[PDB]
């Protein structure tokens, strides 16, 4: 099964109207070091909720 | 599945070689045609 007429650029755009990405709402700040991190994740230095977990 | 080309150097040279071409009058016509066209390789022999 294949088309009988060539679809238009307008239709291309209408189909793609649902493809935009979403950005993270906000980050979190650790209470001891002051770094920014994803909520419920550890930081890039090894802190979580004020405590050093990984060396 | 077995295909058509199955190489063999002795058979190649005995079938299409320089001396085979020279041994007959029509082979010399083949060589003359190829020289007149100006080919870089004249036969199958190294």
């Amino acid at each position: 099964a294949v088309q009988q007429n060539k679809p238009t650029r307008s239709k291309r755009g209408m189909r793609r109207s649902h493809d935009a990405l979403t950005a993270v709402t906000s980050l979190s700040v650790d209470k001891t070091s002051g770094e920014k991190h994803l909520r419920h994740h550890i930081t890039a230095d090894g802190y979580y909720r004020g405590r050093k977990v990984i060396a | 599945m077995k295909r058509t080309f199955q190489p063999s150097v002795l058979k190649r040279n005995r079938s299409h070689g320089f001396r085979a071409r020279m041994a007959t009058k029509n082979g010399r016509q083949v060589l003359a045609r190829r020289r007149a066209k100006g080919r870089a390789r004249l036969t199958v022999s190294k």
């Binding site: 493809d19 935009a20 990405l21 950005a23 993270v24 980050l27 920014k36 994803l38 | -």
Partner: protein
């Protein structure tokens, strides 16, 4: 004052890079860097490098201050394509296109 930076002949499709370019149009530079750091796409690394290059150019060549800068323009254009051959069934050959893009970022203090 406006400062430019570019990446020409990047190995990616423009349709794929535009999805990430749309996220940071008109933002402050610190906010834009924060957004780019937490996006799990390959185009994000490329766009981030171009943004950093633009900021460094504005610091060194025009004497600007980092805290007053905004992403005033950004766009992606299509570049040349490479052509390759891929075999299919029953002795038939198809053509493959490998697409590339140019990326442009403009920062400003106004």
């Amino acid at each position: 004052m406006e400062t430019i930076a570019k990446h020409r002949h990047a190995r990616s499709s423009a349709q794929k890079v535009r999805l990430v370019a749309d996220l940071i149009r008109g933002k402050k530079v610190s906010q834009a860097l924060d957004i780019l750091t937490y996006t799990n796409k390959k185009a994000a690394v490329l766009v981030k490098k171009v943004l950093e290059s633009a900021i460094a150019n504005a610091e060194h060549n025009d004497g600007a201050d980092i805290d007053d800068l905004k992403v005033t323009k950004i766009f992606v254009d299509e570049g040349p394509s490479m052509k390759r051959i891929m075999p299919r069934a029953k002795g038939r050959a198809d053509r493959i296109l490998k697409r590339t893009s140019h990326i442009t970022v403009v920062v400003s203090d106004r």
